[PDB]
Amino acid sequence: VSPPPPIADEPLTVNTGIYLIESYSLDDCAETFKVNAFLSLSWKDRRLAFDPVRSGVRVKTYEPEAIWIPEIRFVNVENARDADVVDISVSPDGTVQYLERFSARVLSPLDFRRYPFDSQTLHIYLIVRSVDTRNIVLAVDLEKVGKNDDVFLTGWDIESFTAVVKPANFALEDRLESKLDYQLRISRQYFSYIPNIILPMLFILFISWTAFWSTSYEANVTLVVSTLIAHIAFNILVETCLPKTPYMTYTGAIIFMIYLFYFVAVIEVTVQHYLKVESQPARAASITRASRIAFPVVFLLANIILAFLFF
Amino acid sequence: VSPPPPIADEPLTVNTGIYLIESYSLDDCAETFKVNAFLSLSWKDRRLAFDPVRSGVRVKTYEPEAIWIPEIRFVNVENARDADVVDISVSPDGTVQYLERFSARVLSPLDFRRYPFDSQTLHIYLIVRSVDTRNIVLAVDLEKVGKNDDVFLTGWDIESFTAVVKPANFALEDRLESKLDYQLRISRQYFSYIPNIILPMLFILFISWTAFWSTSYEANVTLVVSTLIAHIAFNILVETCLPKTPYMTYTGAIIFMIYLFYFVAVIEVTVQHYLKVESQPARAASITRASRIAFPVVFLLANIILAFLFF
Amino acid sequence: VSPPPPIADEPLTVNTGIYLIESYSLDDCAETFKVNAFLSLSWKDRRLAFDPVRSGVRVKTYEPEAIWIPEIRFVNVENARDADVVDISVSPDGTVQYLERFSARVLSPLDFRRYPFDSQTLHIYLIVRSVDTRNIVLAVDLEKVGKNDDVFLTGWDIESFTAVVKPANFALEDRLESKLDYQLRISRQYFSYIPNIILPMLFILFISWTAFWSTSYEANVTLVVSTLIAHIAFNILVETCLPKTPYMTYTGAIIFMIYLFYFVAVIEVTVQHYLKVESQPARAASITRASRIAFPVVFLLANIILAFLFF
Amino acid sequence: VSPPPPIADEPLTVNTGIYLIESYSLDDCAETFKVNAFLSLSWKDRRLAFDPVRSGVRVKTYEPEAIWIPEIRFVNVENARDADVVDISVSPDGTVQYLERFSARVLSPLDFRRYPFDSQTLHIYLIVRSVDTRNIVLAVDLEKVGKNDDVFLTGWDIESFTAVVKPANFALEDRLESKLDYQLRISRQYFSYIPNIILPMLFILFISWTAFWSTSYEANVTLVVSTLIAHIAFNILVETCLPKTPYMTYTGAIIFMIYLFYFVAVIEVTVQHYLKVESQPARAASITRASRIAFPVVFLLANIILAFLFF
Amino acid sequence: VSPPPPIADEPLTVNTGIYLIESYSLDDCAETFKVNAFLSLSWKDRRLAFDPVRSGVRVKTYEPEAIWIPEIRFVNVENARDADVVDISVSPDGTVQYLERFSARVLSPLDFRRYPFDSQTLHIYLIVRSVDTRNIVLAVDLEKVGKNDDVFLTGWDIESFTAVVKPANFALEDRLESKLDYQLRISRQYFSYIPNIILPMLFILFISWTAFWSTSYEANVTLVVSTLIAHIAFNILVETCLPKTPYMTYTGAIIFMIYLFYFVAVIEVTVQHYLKVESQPARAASITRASRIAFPVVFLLANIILAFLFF
């Protein structure tokens, strides 16, 4: 049939809950994550209320086709979720207790500015469009909101699974819509980042700095240029592990700065050679001697500045 | 039943509207984008007209099987859309208000000539094939054409979501077809393009220009050729965030020009060495001294010419 | 029900037509292409004959389950097509006019020997298996064979969409099968192939040829070997663009020849050094001087020979 | 109908059994694997009991819709399994022998710390949610738990397929849930890892150690830096064989250590040159002479330490 | 209804036949191959027998739901086949002639030890589980086993499509199962392997051998190490068209040997330099002179040993 009628003039309250069973396929590029969970729904339908000591027990079961069920959808899913109704139970008062198991690919924007020290809030937005007969409003039953303890996303610490109790009620295409924000909080657990990305990248840069204890222009050109190639090769090696964002990231700023340093090291190597060749070895020597301290110090300072700007 | 009959001899007007809920998976290579939206349909079916007084209730709800619904399809979709009828509402005059939520992978050609300063117009073409009994014509209800504020496509600014009100009515396979052009305007927001692509690429090129302050042929060969390798290695690194195109792009033209510059720098390095070896060091020195200014100037000029040609 | 009965002993003619709505996902590696088109079918089933006067209607509309429809399949599809019956129209003589919109991934062999100056004929084979009751034969209604003007395949010029009118009638597993060849002719458009693949590849090779104006064995080893690395790096860069083939392609023959040239250039560099070292500088000088003309000339000649062999 | 009623107040026991037909698509990155297996279910339903003599038959076959079947689901699947009921058989007492063939993509966490000498325990968790009328409990029929001998996962030795007989009975969303742990034990068989990964990687490192029999700073810089590039290039080559891991792996630790060794070799090469240049050739020579033994010994020592820490 | 009853105590014989329409998507990594074929089935069901005279025909057509059909499955498929019943024909004696068109992704292990001179036998295992009423046994109708002449797998010669007539009858989960082995024989046709992989790889190795006509340690270090980089770069280039295998392949053995040769060439270059430096130029010269013949000879010999050892 159609929606339940109101006692007075009130909207229908659909008590919702989401219990996370599985979390997988967090795609950093697509900004999507796959979820496998329970969706619990509860609402009052008077037309279904019954007498207990006349019925032979206290709670009866229905098929989805037999009764009216609210049309709940998710806002930020790519395709409609794959759902399987687990159970429908009517208490004597007429309260319906719906339960389904669903899997869905959820689109939630990600902010990689602080990579690999970034935290994310993954959203699952529940929605219900009000009907002509009556208005439908979503609510949160906190007893029904949780997550399985072994829920995992490799590379992340799963912080919390909560819901913003107060729904976002608004008008859309001339009709009322009640929205619910379910939040999955995750923070990045990237340990190997140091021995995998930073450390070998810094060793290559440090090798270039040995050109400050050499006067051989040929040896210096080989040091600075070949390390620059090794650095680029190393990025090609590590690119897989990085964000690929249209905005500047923290790790990306360090990498950019390392490119600047190779350029400055070339200028020095070039300058030192020109001065030597132009019979000014005292200046060439003082510049090289300064560079030995200037390069690490300016590097360390600029990194402190960067860290400060990002955090 | 079959389509509603005409009052006179007029075609049936189906008032359409698309409201963008989500936009995702813009594939630059496939020239496709995924969309999750509402499709609203409106027409008049006199056969469904009712007396609100005798019926008591002012709007009646129907199941898709119960009434006639026009067969609306999308022209530029890979497979048929995944749709879910949200609501069907009938008013006393026989006005039908249809609403469905659909997801679809839309094929729309992209023009990368101005990358990364390119703008795109994504198309969603609505179509209806006329029946034997009467002709069907599409129309645009602008109240029903919009987009959710949260609608995002990482790397792009979502400009507008509009529809070309005037349908494209034409004959096909001996029947009338009424087409509607819905347009999603996007412009690229690639800030990080400068520190990610251009700047490190220019530093490598600038390093090869240091061969103009050196007389060592061995050091110069290492500078020019090793930077050329570094440049190629760098492009392999950035390959991913450059579009694969059968036509010349703006970024592609800069990159091609940088390859030409490495070739010219080799010629110079070669020429300077030959002259020195052929006991003409005055010419060798004047060419190298000129190159120091010629190379940056000719580069800067050619880039101005390129920018002008593309914009 | 079962198939329509013959007036005499004649086969049933199914008039077919394919109208290309869209063409996408041409996979050069898989030798597959995706298509979205109309399939029109027309046959006479007298059992459906009606009196327009008695029925009140001039044309009767049926559901696919209501009437007999020939089992048309495609030979060269990955999985069965995704079809959506648009319309079934019966005229009083019993002529059925069927129309469906379908999407399918078609397997059609590709010949890359002339890449990037290759043209392809993409096939879509329609088939019908005859029944015991009567033989079924396919036919082409040319009024119903076409393609939308907007039909595109990035990197190709869509030449024509035609059908070989004469069906291929043959026996298979003790029954008659009537086959139809629909052909989509495409020719490659790769304007950017010259500035993207050939030109930078030729510049690298030309850099190696500068070793013919040098006597420094160390500088020459660096020129030849570093260019060889740059060439390999460049090919890894263009890998994607080139097709992966178990046969020799035109572009592939050029690339192979460029590898041979690097080897010959090494031999020269090696020979010139040995002669100089073995106190024969007059020969070393004459070989190097010859190489300056020999290398470009032999290269240009071998390319003319290759072009001739392939075209 | 609804669930079978209890004789007393006992829960319903569903005897389960999974027989592995095929194992494929072990995705090291996704931490998923695909499975094709039989799912056997057994329970007693008194309502189905029959006298074989009066009925004439020893066994009765039913359609899934005809009888009550428990709702068994898998916990750690991406989407619901693709199942096909093979057979349903009832014995005179009301015992039901259910059998289905299913395929499913299973999510099971993987531990790469000991790669390539790692072993994995793959989990397939069976679950049943209890109903209002009676509690449902899962059990293991070991006669029905097995695997086809042909079962393979390229690169692994399939050790065992077993089930933890004792179910995990617990409460969830106000109802009892009975869980079963099916375990597939696999151990990696990567022999080709030595000639494919380690040996060529060690040869490159050993080439860098030849700088200890050279006094040419230019030759030494080329040896150390060019091998460092070759090492990075080699890792890019083998990157596909190694997994993306947020934790340090054994192979990962060796690779990190090899990066440290290239850095130390640079320091030595740099130190030896500075001492020579600073007119201390006796120290330079003694350091280089020590390095010849120090480098292999410290390397061999640190690898023994690493192996010990990981095993 | 249920299965046909036996005349005497015999099992039911299901005559099978597979006719290959299309072969595509041979995935060397997944060890899977996609196939599009006809599956013909034939068995006797007396319940369906008729006198052609009284019943009004010779043969009659049934719907799959109307009659009993044996449950034939494939053992080595990832998911259940996509099948479409083409025809069901019952002859006067009750001989059922079933025909369906199916597509399936078939898992068949591959042996890359002889790559690219390998041959493969692709298996399609047909199976039937016996019922309580009677045992079911599979048989091969050779008239119904074939393949379309157009059947292709790019890079392979399709040798034969046959079936091992004698089924594999065995017990599983307390019931009889009858298995059939259908074999697709393919042999690799990788012509372009020589100019694409071997030849450029050998040229790089040969370039390293020029260090045997040089006394310049700096030039030699550049030759050996830069070619080693070029070799690795070339392997990254050919990575794609080489088997990723947990076992040693023929090509893999050649490639490993090439890595060993670069290491030995380094030792020589190192030895020759040390002897020269340690005032023993006569030995240095004799070693270098020997290596000129030793290297090609030992290489050519080891390749003959390998070839032999593998074929």
Curated annotation (Swiss-Prot), chains A, B, C, D, E:
Keywords, ordered alphabetically: Cell inner membrane, Cell membrane, Ion channel, Ion transport, Ligand-gated ion channel, Membrane, Potassium, Potassium channel, Potassium transport, Receptor, Signal, Sodium, Sodium channel, Sodium transport, Transmembrane, Transmembrane helix, Transport
Question: Which segments sit on the Periplasmic face?
Answer: 1-189, 241-248
SUPFAM superfamilies membership: Neurotransmitter-gated ion-channel transmembrane pore, Nicotinic receptor ligand binding domain-like
Q: Which domain of life is it from?
A: Bacteria
Regions that span the bilayer = 190-212, 216-240, 249-277, 281-311
Q: Which GO terms describe its molecular function?
A: extracellular ligand-gated monoatomic ion channel activity; identical protein binding; potassium channel activity; sodium channel activity; transmembrane signaling receptor activity
Q: Which InterPro entries match?
A: GABAA/Glycine_rcpt, Neur_chan_lig-bd, Neur_chan_lig-bd_sf, Neur_channel, Neuro-gated_channel_TM_sf, Neuro_actylchol_rec
**Residue ranges annotated as Cytoplasmic topological domain:** 213-215, 278-280
Q: What is the effect of changing E218A?
A: Decreases cation selectivity. Decreases the binding affinity of TEA and TBA. Nearly abolishes block by Cd(2+)
Q: How is its activity regulated?
A: Tetraethylammonium (TEA) and tetrabutylammonium (TBA) inhibit the proton-activated currents in a dose- and voltage-dependent manner in vitro, whereas the blocker of acid sensing ion channels, amiloride, has no effect. Channel current of GLIC can be inhibited by inhaled and intravenous general anesthetics at and below concentrations used clinically. Ion conduction is also inhibited by lidocaine and by divalent transition metal ions such as cadmium ions.
Domain comment from the record reads as follows: Consists of an N-terminal ligand-binding domain that encloses a wide aqueous vestibule and a transmembrane domain that forms a narrow channel.
Q: What protein family does this chain belong to?
A: Belongs to the ligand-gated ion channel (TC 1.A.9) family.
Subunit notes for this chain? Homopentamer.
As for what it does, the entry says: Cationic channel with similar permeabilities for Na(+) and K(+), that is activated by an increase of the proton concentration on the extracellular side. Displays no permeability for chloride ions. Shows slow kinetics of activation, no desensitization and a single channel conductance of 8 pS. Might contribute to adaptation to external pH change.
What's the protein here called?
Proton-gated ion channel
Native species: Gloeobacter violaceus (strain ATCC 29082 / PCC 7421)
Q: Which gene encodes it?
A: glvI
